[PDB]
Write a structure and sequence with these properties.
part of a larger assembly; 8 chains; A alpha+beta; B mainly alpha; C alpha+beta; D mainly alpha; E little secondary structure; F mainly alpha; G mainly alpha; H alpha+beta; A: alpha+beta; 5-stranded mixed sheet; 4 helices; C: alpha+beta; GMP Synthetase, Chain A, domain 3; Ribosomal protein S3 C-terminal domain; 2 domains; 5 strands; globular; RNA-binding; Ribosomal_eS19 (chain B); RNA binding (chain B); ribonucleoprotein (chain B); Ribosomal_eS19_CS (chain B)
Amino acid sequence: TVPSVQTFGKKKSATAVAHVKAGKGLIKVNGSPITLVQPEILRFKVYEPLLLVGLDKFANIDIRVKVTGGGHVSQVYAIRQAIAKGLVAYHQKFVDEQSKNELKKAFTSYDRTLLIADSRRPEPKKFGGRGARSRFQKSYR
Amino acid sequence: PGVSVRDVPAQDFINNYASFLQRQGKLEVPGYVDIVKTSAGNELPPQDSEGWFYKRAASVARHIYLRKQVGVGKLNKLYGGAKNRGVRPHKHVDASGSINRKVLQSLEKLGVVEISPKGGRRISDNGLRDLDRIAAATLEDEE
Amino acid sequence: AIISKKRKLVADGVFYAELNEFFTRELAEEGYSGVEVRVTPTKTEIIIRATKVQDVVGENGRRINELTLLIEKRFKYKRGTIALYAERVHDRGLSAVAQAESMKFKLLNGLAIRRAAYGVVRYVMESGAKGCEVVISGKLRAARAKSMKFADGFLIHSGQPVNDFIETATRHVLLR
Amino acid sequence: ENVWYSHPRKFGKGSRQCRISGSHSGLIRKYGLNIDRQSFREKANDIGFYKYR
Amino acid sequence: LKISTRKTPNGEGSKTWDTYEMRIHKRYIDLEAPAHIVKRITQITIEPGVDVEVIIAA
Amino acid sequence: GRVRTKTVKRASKALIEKYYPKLTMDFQTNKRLCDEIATIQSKRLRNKIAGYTTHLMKRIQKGPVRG
Amino acid sequence: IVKHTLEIINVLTDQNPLQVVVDAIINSGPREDTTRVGGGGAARRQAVDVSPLRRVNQSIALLTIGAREAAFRNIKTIAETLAEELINAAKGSSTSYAIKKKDELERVAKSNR
Amino acid sequence: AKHAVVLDQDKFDRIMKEAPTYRYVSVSVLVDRFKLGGSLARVALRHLENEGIIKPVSKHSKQAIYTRAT
RNA sequence: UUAAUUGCGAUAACGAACGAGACCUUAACCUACUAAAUAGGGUUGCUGGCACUUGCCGGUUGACUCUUCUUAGAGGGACUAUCGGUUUCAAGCCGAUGGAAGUUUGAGGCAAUAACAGGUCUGUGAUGCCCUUAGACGUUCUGGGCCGCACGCGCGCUACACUGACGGAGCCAGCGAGUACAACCUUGGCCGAGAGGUCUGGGUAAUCUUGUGAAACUCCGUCGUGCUGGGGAUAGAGCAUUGUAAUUAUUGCUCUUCAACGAGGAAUUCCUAGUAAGCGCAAGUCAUCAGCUUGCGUUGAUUACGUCCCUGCCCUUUGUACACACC
């Protein structure tokens, strides 16, 4: 009955799934509200999707996230990519396009990935050296 | 409203819980207090000295609330951390078992922890009351 | 039983690896390419592809009848669960393992070093092949390390199209 | 025939052995193989191992 | 299933390493069917190079 | 360093010489006409024929070419 | 640490702290930096000019070298020293090593001109 | 030991004299005058936060910046 | 021009093969197919507590149904695409725009002819012949050594602390591995200041260990620029464990012993992006022993984006009294 689209973002192995609904305005992270997060200095990064477009958009939409994988700081990107898509999925389906297109071009000027998935994955460590490129120390004395 | 444990911050949750226990002084004391290292690898004893156990017992109670059933060996592995084993790389080994066990044994008689099936320790009905009352008290401190 | 699936899959490979090694020794005189095992319910079909088929079977069940009893005592099995057949080979030219046995005979008998290779290279093209290569090594006349080569046609050395196409076969000989 | 003709050889390097000849060095015991690392390269594809990457 | 190994039969020259590995595909098809119908499907549908096995107990 | 190989240009000359019809400007339509006639094994090598054939169509409107 | 450096500048004579940071980048970027030319064997230094990212990339590095060396065995932890380096460069005092390391290379080019 | 760590009652008079009206007030600032060296400066600064006097900006261990109460 | 005898163009040269490129494996993209109580989510029930209105946190593999994550079949997606400059305005290279992806899209796997008297007879019932062939250089049991200590070089670990150490509090990964004829990984509960004792399991393994809640990190306190609370070496006594056996400290733990070293002289090695360098984890050997090697994921820069000055490699043109070839 209620509008439900299962948006998800991804930075490295850190994945997050934002199940949006219609109601009062919840933006919870692992049960707790938006203002925890828990890196503590990077609380300001999680607001960036909210403060650009505005809090007026979230008055109808109710989001809640479960984050797993990666580390501490990598999971903040997973939340931020999930919430950014969470609006677009709602505004694409059941709202006019001109609002949703203003979200797109707003996030291009402050493009810290947001909608776009990041390219970098880890690369194998090959034999003979302490890393991929880094080789062992030689001696011919 | 929606009064839950998650609205209160995790670090700030234990401060109100610690002072709540010290008023009564009915959580019980084992006997090994301040004759203690704290972990298997830790040069200095507890700096807090007095109190101390009431900080530990509060943080054990809130973790038993969130999860299904927590045990002794897992709590030692969770609290325990790094070492300095001479001139080698730093390893990880469990903390003190005797401290974390008597937290769980004493909290049963006070009225928080319950004996669960399969294995571990889950929460009682009266245990959820004291967790929410202190959470509601911490909500009043902020608001 | 009850054993894990990773352990039995590796143990299946070594079981065959033993069987392939002994038939190299035992069927040296009668010709031998390889063995193909197919474990059906209860019984097991062991198909030995060889040149001289009737000699591998023997005198109406003698060579294979004795060899079936050997496999039981090695790997612990009953009379009925194993059946050693003998089928013909799909040509000699493409199946490169067959040429090594013929070459092994020609050196042990006392035939020419170079002209044995000139004979077999033609036979590879006569069957229907693209190219060929026969590298003989060791002290071929005089007391020093030497090598030979008698190639023909196109021979591809790299890429994944290598394992499928090129049939290889190494087989050592003495002599004095 | 003689009484003392053994040692407690239920552990270590001396008791353990390969299937082929019996070398007490470079022994692969992973997955219960017991084939030394010189002969494993020879018999890799027959068992089913391949150099994919 | 990996077994990393040095290439040499002695251990001289340059130091090089391999990754000889064995793959293993694994499937499950759970029937809610009668007893004797499993005796039909097990006899047929066998092709060499595949490990057939049935539990017949939940 | 994306210099196209000889085996790509073997097909690119042979296709355009005979089939000048069924070749018009864009990648996607001309890409469907490469696998049509020829029998290429891989995807990578098949699509690389479509790349250089389509590039010659851009030049053909600005005069001819040798060969 | 970078947040704590900006909090110091906000207290000192009000001011937007990025105005002190940007002016520090201007006053620690060398005009002329000589490249070691051979011409036989000896290390004669020809006067080559510097623009534009090389003025910015060197200047930001020289501030952090002067900042961290000042807080090597010291109560005055990095944030206090880094804040002082930017004030000295913005208000050209000829004391901070962001300016001195820039000024001492000026200078070397004109000798071989 | 470079002195100025030992507790003296004569110094405690002069701490309250030089407390008010300053731009920079921290653990980094007081040690430059050769006052209570190291940790006893932190305890001296902890007194000045209780009854107003000097009000805070940052609240971290190792980064403790304060400014005068206007 | 290219990473490349890679291609354009010039022509006693015309077409061809091998090597490279193509091929194969792995890492990304798919709300479209095909699917699952050994993967996770929603509807809801039964229920436990909570703010007392609709709603918040749940505990059960009670029911119903499904595929965003998740595994893996089967396909597509990339072709320098489309434009702008720049070139016999050729082959390419460089600036935008679209795009998850624009260095061969990242990294490996396979690897030509021709050689070196490079390594292995200490992997071998792969092996020529010489030695050794019972008073045995075959053997077999038992003590001892491969680790002796004025002295050199080679990889390495931990430090020369305040971007730090010592306390609590917060609390997140991925590669793996694992017994039934042995003694494997081993949660939960009691004993213990530790190490480790014991009762029980579960697991032949996306089912149980296991969410392998691992470190570095985060955030308030304790010390503050003194060989110091930094650092941990030498030392002595006992308590544990694996072994037929630990004295030539096997290994870990408990108090004491508390040094050397205030950023390293000539020299010198490795390195262009999820890389470098911190950081631990797993496996390999393994009765018991990582300061090692091979693999994985967290934290994630500065600085080129060019050149033959140095050290060596490929061709052409020149000279040779060299050809087991400037040793």
